[PDB]
Amino acid sequence: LPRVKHTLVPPPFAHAHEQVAASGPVINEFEMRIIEKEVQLDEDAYLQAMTFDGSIPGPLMIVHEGDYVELTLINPPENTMPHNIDFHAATGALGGGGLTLINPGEKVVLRFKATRAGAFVYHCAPGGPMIPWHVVSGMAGCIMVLPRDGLKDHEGKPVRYDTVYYIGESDHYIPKDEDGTYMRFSDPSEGYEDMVAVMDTLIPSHIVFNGAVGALTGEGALKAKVGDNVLFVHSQPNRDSRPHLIGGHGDLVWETGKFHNAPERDLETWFIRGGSAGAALYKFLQPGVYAYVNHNLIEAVHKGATAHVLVEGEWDNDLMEQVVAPVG
Amino acid sequence: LPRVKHTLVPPPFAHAHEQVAASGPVINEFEMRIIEKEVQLDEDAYLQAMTFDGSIPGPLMIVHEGDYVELTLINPPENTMPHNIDFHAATGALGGGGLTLINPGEKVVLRFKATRAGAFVYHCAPGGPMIPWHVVSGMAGCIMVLPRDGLKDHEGKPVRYDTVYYIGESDHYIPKDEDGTYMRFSDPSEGYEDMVAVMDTLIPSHIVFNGAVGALTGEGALKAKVGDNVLFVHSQPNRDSRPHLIGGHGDLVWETGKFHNAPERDLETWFIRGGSAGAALYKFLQPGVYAYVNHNLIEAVHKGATAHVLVEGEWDNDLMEQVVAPVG
Amino acid sequence: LPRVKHTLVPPPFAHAHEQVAASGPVINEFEMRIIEKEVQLDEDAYLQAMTFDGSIPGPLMIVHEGDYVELTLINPPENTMPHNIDFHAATGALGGGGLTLINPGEKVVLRFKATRAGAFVYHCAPGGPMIPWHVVSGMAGCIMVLPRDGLKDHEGKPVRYDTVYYIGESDHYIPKDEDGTYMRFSDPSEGYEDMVAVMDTLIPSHIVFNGAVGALTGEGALKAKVGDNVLFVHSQPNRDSRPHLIGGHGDLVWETGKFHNAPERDLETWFIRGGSAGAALYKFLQPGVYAYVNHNLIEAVHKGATAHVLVEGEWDNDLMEQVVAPVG
Numbered sequence: 014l015p016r017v018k019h020t021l022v023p024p025p026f027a028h029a030h031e032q033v034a035a036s037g038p039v040i041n042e043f044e045m046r047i048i049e050k051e052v053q054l055d056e057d058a059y060l061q062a063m064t065f066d067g068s069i070p071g072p073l074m075i076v077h078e079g080d081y082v083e084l085t086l087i088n089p090p091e092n093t094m095p096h097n098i099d100f101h102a103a104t105g106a107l108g109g110g111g112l113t114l115i116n117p118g119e120k121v122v123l124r125f126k127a128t129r130a131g132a133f134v135y136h137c138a139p140g141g142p143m144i145p146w147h148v149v150s151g152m153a154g155c156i157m158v159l160p161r162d163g164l165k166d167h168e169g170k171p172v173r174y175d176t177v178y179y180i181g182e183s184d185h186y187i188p189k190d191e192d193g194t195y196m197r198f199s200d201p202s203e204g205y206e207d208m209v210a211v212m213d214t215l216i217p218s219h220i221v222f223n224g225a226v227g228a229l230t231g232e233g234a235l236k237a238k239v240g241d242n243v244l245f246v247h248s249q250p251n252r253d254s255r256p257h258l259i260g261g262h263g264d265l266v267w268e269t270g271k272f273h274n275a276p277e278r279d280l281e282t283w284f285i286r287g288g289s290a291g292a293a294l295y296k297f298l299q300p301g302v303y304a305y306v307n308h309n310l311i312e313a314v315h316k317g318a319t320a321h322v323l324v325e326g327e328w329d330n331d332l333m334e335q336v337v338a339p340v341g
Numbered sequence: 342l343p344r345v346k347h348t349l350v351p352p353p354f355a356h357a358h359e360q361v362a363a364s365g366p367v368i369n370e371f372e373m374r375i376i377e378k379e380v381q382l383d384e385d386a387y388l389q390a391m392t393f394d395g396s397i398p399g400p401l402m403i404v405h406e407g408d409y410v411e412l413t414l415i416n417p418p419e420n421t422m423p424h425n426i427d428f429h430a431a432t433g434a435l436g437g438g439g440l441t442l443i444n445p446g447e448k449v450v451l452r453f454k455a456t457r458a459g460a461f462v463y464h465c466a467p468g469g470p471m472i473p474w475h476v477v478s479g480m481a482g483c484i485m486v487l488p489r490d491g492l493k494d495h496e497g498k499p500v501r502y503d504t505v506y507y508i509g510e511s512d513h514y515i516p517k518d519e520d521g522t523y524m525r526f527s528d529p530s531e532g533y534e535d536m537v538a539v540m541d542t543l544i545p546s547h548i549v550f551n552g553a554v555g556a557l558t559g560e561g562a563l564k565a566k567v568g569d570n571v572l573f574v575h576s577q578p579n580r581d582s583r584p585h586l587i588g589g590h591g592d593l594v595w596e597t598g599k600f601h602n603a604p605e606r607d608l609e610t611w612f613i614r615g616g617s618a619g620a621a622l623y624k625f626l627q628p629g630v631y632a633y634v635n636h637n638l639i640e641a642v643h644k645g646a647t648a649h650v651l652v653e654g655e656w657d658n659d660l661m662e663q664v665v666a667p668v669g
Numbered sequence: 670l671p672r673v674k675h676t677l678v679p680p681p682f683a684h685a686h687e688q689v690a691a692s693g694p695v696i697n698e699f700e701m702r703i704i705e706k707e708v709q710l711d712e713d714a715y716l717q718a719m720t721f722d723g724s725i726p727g728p729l730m731i732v733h734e735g736d737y738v739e740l741t742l743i744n745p746p747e748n749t750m751p752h753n754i755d756f757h758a759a760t761g762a763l764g765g766g767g768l769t770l771i772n773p774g775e776k777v778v779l780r781f782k783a784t785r786a787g788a789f790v791y792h793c794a795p796g797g798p799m800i801p802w803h804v805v806s807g808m809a810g811c812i813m814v815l816p817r818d819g820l821k822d823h824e825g826k827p828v829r830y831d832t833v834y835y836i837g838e839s840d841h842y843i844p845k846d847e848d849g850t851y852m853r854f855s856d857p858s859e860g861y862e863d864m865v866a867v868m869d870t871l872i873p874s875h876i877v878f879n880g881a882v883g884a885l886t887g888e889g890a891l892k893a894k895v896g897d898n899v900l901f902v903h904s905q906p907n908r909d910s911r912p913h914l915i916g917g918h919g920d921l922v923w924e925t926g927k928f929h930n931a932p933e934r935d936l937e938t939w940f941i942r943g944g945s946a947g948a949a950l951y952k953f954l955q956p957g958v959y960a961y962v963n964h965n966l967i968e969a970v971h972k973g974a975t976a977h978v979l980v981e982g983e984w985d986n987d988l989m990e991q992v993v994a995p996v997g
C-alpha cells in the first residue's frame with residue numbers, strides 16, 4: 014500500500030487533507046511526542062498537564078474509511094510516567110492501549126485499520142486509576158475517519174465543508190488550598206492525591222476548549238464568512254457536553270459522531286457523550302460574532318466552555334432586523 | 342404581510358393557535374414585560390427571580406415555519422438591571438441578544454424569520470456572568486415553530502394533537518446561611534455572590550416545573566382524558582433533564598425538539614439537553630393519575646421536578662389488571 | 670391463552686427464552702421475592718439494600734411484544750417496609766405501582782400487556798421520598814420485550830444474537846462519618862437521614878454494575894468468543910450513563926432501548942438516560958480482554974462502573990498490529 018506521512022498541526026486547525034479520498038486505501042503515518050508540563054488554564058489556575066504533542070486536546074488526525082493508521086508514539090526521557098494510547102476508532106487490544114504502553118525513553122509503533130467512519134476520541138489509558146487521571150490531565154484528542162466518498166446528508170446527498178475546526182473540550186479538577194487559592198505542584202505526581210479528592214466530587218474546576226479558558230476567543234477566535242459551510246468536530250473524552258452555536262444552528266448534526274448514521278437537522282443544541290466525538294455542519298448566513306458554548310451556561314461562563322466565531326459578510330434584514338432601537 | 346397580534350397566556354397553557362397554518366406567512370406580533378421579583382420555590386425557599394412576563398418559564402409563543410416574529414420587549418423602570426433576549430429559533434446577532442439589550446425604562450422591537458421548525462428555547466443573555474445568572478434566576482421560555490402543514494410522524498403521516506402543554510423545567514441555586522436555612526435578599530444583586538458559590542458546585546438546590554415545587558400538582562395538575570393525544574413541550578435552558586410519563590410512554594418523541602427530524606417511538610424516558618426544548622406526544626389509554634417527572638428520581642422528588650396529569654375515562658383491564666389484591 | 674412459567678436467574682445472565690417467538694401471545698408467569706439486606710459494595714463500603722429477588726439489579730424478564738406478563742410479587746414478613754413495582758413496559762396505574770403496594774407479609778398478582786417492544790426499567794416506587802430512596806437502595810431491574818419476529822437492523826433485516834447479557838448500573842449514596850469512613854447501620858431506616866444528605870448533593874459514592882465494585886470482573890467477567898454477536902442490555906433507573914466497550918464498538922445501538930426505532934451503527938460510546946434501558950449489539954472480531962465501562966472515567970474507575978469481557982479466538986493483525994514493540 015501507498016504510505017502517506019502527515020504533519021500534524023495544533024488544534025483547532027487540521028492537517029492538510031481532502032474530504033473525498035484521492036486514492037484507494039493508504040497507510041497513514043503519524044508521529045506524536047508525549048509532553049508533560051504545567052499549563053495555565055485561567056488567570057489564577059494551573060494544571061499539571063500530560064499531553065499528546067504538547068497540546069490539549071491532542072492534534073486531529075484525518076484519514077478515510079478502510080485506510081490504515083500507523084502511529085509512532087514517543088515518550089521522551091524527561092517525562093515522569095508511562096503512557097499509552099487507546100483509539101476508539103480501532104478494533105482490539107483496548108483500542109491499542111494494550112500494545113502501546115511506553116516508559117519515558119521509549120517509543121512504539123502501532124498500526125490499525127480505520128474500519129469505521131466517524132470522529133473518534135483517542136486517549137491515554139495506562140491502567141486502573143491512571144486512566145481517568147491521565148485523561149483529566151489533558152491526554153486526549155480525536156481522529157476523524159471520513160467515508161472514502163466524503164460526507165453525505167440525511168438523504169444520502171453529498172455535503173462538502175469549506176472549513177473544519179476541531180474543538181476539544183476537557184474537564185479538569187484543580188485542587189484548592191485552605192485559602193481557596195488553586196494549588197500548584199512541582200509535577201503531576203505531587204498533585205495527584207489533591208486532584209483525586211476533587212475528581213471524586215465529579216465537579217470540574219474548569220471545562221475548557223483548546224486547553225484554556227478563552228483559548229478560542231480574542232486572537233484565538235474561529236474565523237468564517239457568510240456562505241462558508243463549517244464542520245465543528247467536538248470531543249469530550251470524560252464528561253458530557255451540550256454544544257450550541259449562539260445565533261446559529263446545527264444544519265446537519267451527527268451528535269454520536271459516526272458518519273454513516275443519518276444526521277439530524279436544525280438543532281439548537283446537541284449532545285456529546287463523555288467518551289466520544291460528535292460533528293455538526295453549519296452554513297453561515299449572518300455576519301458578526303457567534304459564541305460556541307457548552308449550553309450548561311455555568312459550564313460555559315464560570316468554568317470556561319466558551320469559544321467565539323467571527324464571521325465576515327453582509328447582514329440580511331429579512332432573517333433578523335432591529336425594527337425599533339432601544340427607546341424610552 | 343398580514344399581521345397577527347397574539348395574547349400570551351401563562352404556562353403550562355398556550356395562546357390560541359392552529360396546528361396547521363390557516364394562512365401563508367404572517368408577521369406574528371408579541372409583547373412581553375420583564376418582571377424582577379422574589380418568588381417562593383418551596384415552603385422554605387425563595388428565589389430572586391427575573392422573568393419574561395412574570396412567569397417561570399416565560400410564556401409559550403406558537404408560530405409556523407416561514408412566519409416572522411416581531412417582539413416588543415419592555416424593561417419597566419422598576420427593574421434593577423439590563424436584560425435582553427436570545428431566541429434559539431432565530432438566525433444572527435446571538436439569537437437577537439445583540440439587538441435587544443435594554444435598560445430599565447426602555448423597550449425594543451426585534452423581528453426575525455422563523456426559518457426552522459421545532460420547539461426552541463428563548464432566554465435572556467446580557468453578557469459574561471450575567472448570562473447564566475439571568476437564566477438560573479428564571480429568565481427563559483420557549484417558542485414553538487410548527488411546520489406550516491402541522492406535525493408528521495416517522496412515516497411522514499399527519500399527526501394531530503388535542504392538547505399542548507408547555508412544561509418549563511428550571512434549575513436554581515439558592516444559597517444557605519450557616520444555620521442551613523435558605524437565604525433571602527432585598528433584590529437580585531444582593532443575592533448574587535452567595536448564589537454564584539452554589540452555581541459553581543453545579544448542584545441545583547431546586548429543579549422545578551412551572552416555576553415552583555408542586556406548581557403542576559394539586560390545583561395545577563395537567564388534565565386530559567382517555568383518547569386525548571397530548572403534546573408535552575419541555576424546555577430546559579441550562580441543564581439536562583430526562584422526562585418520563587409514569588404509567589405512560591412517549592408515542593412520538595422529538596427529544597432534540599426539531600420537527601423535520603423523524604421522531605422515535607415507544608420511549609420510556611427521553612432526554613432534553615440543557616439549552617433546548619424537546620417534544621413528546623402521547624395518546625392516553627388508561628384513566629387515573631400520571632406523574633410527569635425528571636427521571637433522576639432525586640431531582641424528581643427531592644429537588645422538585647414532578648408534575649401530575651389527571652386523566653378521565655374508563656379503565657382497560659386488558660392493558661393492566663390487579664389479578665390478586667394484596668393478601669397474606 | 671397458553672401460560673408459561675419462567676424461572677428467573679441472577680443477572681448478568683438471562684432465563685431461557687427464544688429471540689423469535691415460538692408461539693402467538695402467551696401469559697408469562699414470573700415470581701419475585703423482595704429481600705432487604707446489607708450488601709457490600711466495595712472493600713470499605715456497605716449498602717442497606719432493598720432488592721427484587723436478592724440481586725442488584727433485579728433479574729431480567731424476557732417476553733415478546735403482545736404477550737401478557739403476570740407477576741406474583743411477595744414481600745416476606747421479615748422485611749421492614751412496604752414495596753411495590755412500576756414497569757416502564759406497562760400502561761396505566763403508574764406502571765403497576767398503584768396496584769402492587771404490599772406490606773411485609775403480603776403478596777399481590779399484577780397482569781399487564783407487553784404492548785411495546787424494547788428493554789424497559791422496572792423499579793420500586795412506593796410514593797414520595799420513598800421513590801428515589803428505594804431505587805438508590807437497589808430496587809430496580811429490567812424487562813426485555815422482543816418483537817415477536819426478533820430483532821431487526823437499520824434496514825429492517827434480521828439480526829440474531831448469540832448471547833445476551835444484562836448489565837444493571839446503579840448509583841448509590843453511602844454516607845461517611847466524621848472520620849471519613851463509610852457508615853454502617855442496623856437496617857435501611859436507621860441509615861435514611863444520613864443517606865438523604867448524600868442524595869441531595871447528587872454525587873454518588875458508588876456507581877456499580879451487577880451490584881458491587883468489580884462484580885463483573887475476575888470470576889464474574891463476561892465471556893465470549895470471536896464471531897459471537899452479543900447483546901448488551903444496560904439499565905440505569907436513576908442517573909445517566911455513557912457505555913463504551915473498550916477495544917470494540919456498538920455495531921447496532923438502540924440507546925433509548927426501543928426496538929422498533931432504527932438503531933445507530935459504529936458507535937464508540939452511547940447514552941443511557943437515567944430511568945431507562947438501552948441495548949447494543951457487537952460482534953467480536955478480536956480476542957482478548959475488553960472493558961465495558963461508563964465512559965465518565967472517574968465513574969468507571971473511582972466509583973466502580975467497570976466490567977470485563979474475556980474473549981477467546983484468534984488475533985487478526987490486519988485489524989491491529991504492534992509494528993514496533995516498545996524500544997529505546
Ligand SMILES: O=N[O-]
Nearest residue numbers: 259260427436466
Ligand atoms: O444561546 N446562547 O446561550
Ligand SMILES: O=N[O-]
Nearest residue numbers: 587588755764794
Ligand atoms: O416510573 N416512575 O419513576
Ligand SMILES: O=N[O-]
Nearest residue numbers: 099108138915916
Ligand atoms: O476506551 N477506554 O476508556
Ligand SMILES: [Cu+2]
Nearest residue numbers: 096137147152
Ligand atoms: Cu498518559
Ligand SMILES: [Cu+2]
Nearest residue numbers: 099101136288
Ligand atoms: Cu475510551
Ligand SMILES: [Cu+2]
Nearest residue numbers: 424465475480
Ligand atoms: Cu435578564
Ligand SMILES: [Cu+2]
Nearest residue numbers: 427429464616
Ligand atoms: Cu442559548
Ligand SMILES: [Cu+2]
Nearest residue numbers: 752793803808
Ligand atoms: Cu421498595
Ligand SMILES: [Cu+2]
Nearest residue numbers: 755757792944
Ligand atoms: Cu420509573
